[PDB]
């Protein structure tokens, strides 16, 4: 057995003290003129290269002074102090050089630590840079993670400066993969072209290879004429090899074209009695019901948000203590292809059913039972999708419960029983808007166009608000059978305002049906009635949100009609 409360701590601390006092040292590392006196035992036990450096019989084994080059002084110093104390204390800037020096010195523990730190920090921009870094220094985990992040984001950016400087093999792997998140086939063509326009006559063979890779569907559009404009003179066989890429090489449809606009539902009626809730999806066009994996698989009462880039996030929630419902501030993100949930930076307060709002690329969590004992029981907390951190902002004016919040015209709007405040993120200030004449709670609002549609409350209250008109007005009442409790759900569908409502009576079964609403008609025309043969009962605490998903990655929910 290994001790950890007696000799281990004392031995490590005494070794650190000996290192500080320059005692019992027999080897000194020379790094561009900087001296690092240390011990051979610690270097042998930490690094897998120093053990061969001092054990294998050569001229440097019996050498008091060793001139080690191609290593940074600060990185070697931090590696030595980690070996002498066990604490790494890595920043976010010197990770690349630290990993390079760890790979050169073959220090497995710090290599794993840096690998985890890098795989956790593929946020938005270093994806291609760290992908190239992992291609240079073989790292399967980093390579796969960066490949997936690139397939997700570069397919929407395809203009990064670092992306231009990539090796042929990595670019071939990226382009030939069927994970490109592109709704059109010309964007990848123009990305490949611009990758082959800044460096031409140098990668002409690789130009032909990428030309073949992009395949006929985009090869038959403009590439021939642009190449004729840009071909080197006295090139004949290149024309012959380029003309050949018209018939062969298995023209097949891509995967990114399957961005069907669907509805993500959470906390549904679980088919199995072992489970309590489940997350499922519905297809407005395919008329099918898909399922999703629960992010924690045990925690419920979560809030949903969808960014303009079609991303799904989960924050807050409560989980049973499983002693022999505790609130957790954990955060999660849904993978559009792996059908899993990768966690992210947790929150600072354990919220219950938080309301997350996206604006200016930032996620804003408004209310949702943060604490309560704080002097200002009316506070908020936002998220940074780029820096991956939580920043405190101006708190709420008034404390509200069972509230709803949306975003309109790049402005934060939160709706409560009767009041509404317009938070302006740029000035971090709250603007008093208008007050509703009806006091209704337990309802949600939808941000369709430039008008906020607060639907329901306790009912069928349809109160329409306009940012420009700054006024609340009524339109009509949704045609709902009497003696019923309509679970109204308002959300945008295909750039058209629609609703998803369910009616329940006494000794009667629930019915699901969505209606098409018109702005000037003030009527909910019958758009589609959801048949019970494909969709079963959902419940009462279910939530609805609009997002695009992949049918192949997800799986259909089995249920008897």
């Amino acid at each position: 057995r290994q001790i950890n409360t007696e000799y281990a701590v004392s031995l490590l601390e005494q070794l650190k003290l000996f290192y500080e006092q320059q005692l019992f040292t027999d080897i000194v590392l020379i790094v561009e003129g900087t001296e690092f006196p240390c011990h051979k035992m610690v270097l042998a036990t930490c690094s897998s290269y120093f053990r061969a450096m001092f054990m294998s019989g050569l001229s440097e084994s019996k050498q008091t002074h060793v001139h080690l080059r191609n290593v940074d002084a600060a990185t070697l110093q931090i590696i030595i102090t980690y070996a002498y104390t066990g604490n790494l204390a890595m920043n976010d800037s010197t990770v690349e050089q630290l990993y390079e020096t760890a790979c050169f010195l073959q220090v497995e523990d710090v290599l794993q630590r840096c690998r985890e730190y890098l795989i956790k920090k593929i946020n938005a921009e270093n994806c291609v840079r760290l992908l190239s870094f992992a291609d240079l220094f073989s790292c399967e985990e980093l390579k796969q993670s960066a490949k997936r992040m690139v397939e997700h984001k570069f397919t929407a950016v395809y203009h990064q400066d670092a992306f231009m400087q990539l090796s042929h093999d990595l670019l071939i792997d990226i382009l030939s993969s069927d994970n490109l998140n592109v709704e059109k086939e010309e964007t990848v063509r123009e990305a490949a072209m611009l990758w082959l326009e800044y460096n031409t006559e140098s990668r002409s063979q690789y130009l032909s290879s990428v030309l073949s890779q992009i395949r006929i569907d985009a090869l038959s559009e403009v590439t021939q004429r642009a190449w004729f404009q840009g071909l080197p003179p006295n090139d004949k066989s290149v024309v012959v090899q380029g003309l050949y890429k018209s018939m062969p090489k298995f023209f097949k449809p891509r995967l990114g074209m399957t961005k069907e606009e669907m509805m993500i539902f959470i906390e549904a009626s679980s088919e199995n009695p072992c489970s309590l809730y489940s997350s499922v999806c519905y297809s407005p066009q395919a008329e099918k019901v898909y399922k999703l994996c629960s992010p924690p698989a045990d925690l419920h009462k979560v809030g949903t948000v969808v960014t303009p880039d079609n991303d799904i996030y989960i924050a807050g929630g409560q989980v049973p203590l499983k002693n022999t419902f505790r609130t957790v501030n954990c955060f999660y993100w849904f993978d559009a292809q792996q059908n899993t949930w990768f966690p992210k930076t947790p929150m600072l307060f354990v919220r219950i059913k938080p309301s997350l709002v996206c604006c200016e690329g930032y996620i804003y969590a408004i209310g949702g039972d943060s604490v309560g004992g704080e002097l200002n029981r009316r506070t908020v907390e936002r998220y940074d999708t780029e820096k991956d951190e939580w920043t405190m902002v101006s708190p709420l004016p008034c404390a509200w419960q069972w509230s709803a919040a949306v975003v309109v015209h790049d402005c934060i709007y939160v709706m409560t029983l009767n009041l509404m405040y317009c938070y302006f993120p740029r000035s971090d200030s709250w603007v008093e808007m208008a007050m509703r004449q009806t006091s209704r709670s337990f309802a949600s609002a939808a941000a369709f166009g430039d008008k906020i549609f607060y639907i329901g409350g306790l009912s069928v209250t349809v109160e329409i608000y306009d940012v420009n008109k700054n006024e609340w007005k009524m339109a009509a009442n949704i045609p709902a059978k009497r003696y019923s409790d309509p679970c109204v759900r308002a959300v945008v569908i295909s750039n058209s305002l629609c609703v998803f409502m369910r009616e329940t009576h006494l000794n009667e079964r629930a019915k699901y049906v969505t209606y098409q609403y018109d702005l000037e008609l003030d009527r909910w025309s019958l758009r589609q009635h959801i048949s019970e043969r494909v969709l079963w009962d959902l419940g009462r605490d279910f939530r609805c949100t609009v997002g695009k998903l992949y049918p192949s990655c997800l799986e259909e929910s089995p249920w008897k009609p």
Binding site: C422, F424, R426, S427, S429, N468
Partner: protein
Amino acid sequence: QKVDDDRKHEIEAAIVRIMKSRKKMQHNVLVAEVTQQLKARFLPSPVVIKKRIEGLIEREYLARTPEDRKVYTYVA
């Protein structure tokens, strides 16, 4: 001339009644709102409103400093 002066005072009255409970403007943010509020009244007259909004900087009550346009004085 009388109706021009009437419009010139009406726009100032609107801008001092509305922006006293609204947000700020960096380059051309609040002018769109003030034109939308007056869309049903008359033409926006961009040059007239642009020349008139910069005349109030000589004194207090939302001077709207051009160099310090990052934040406006939300005071009386």
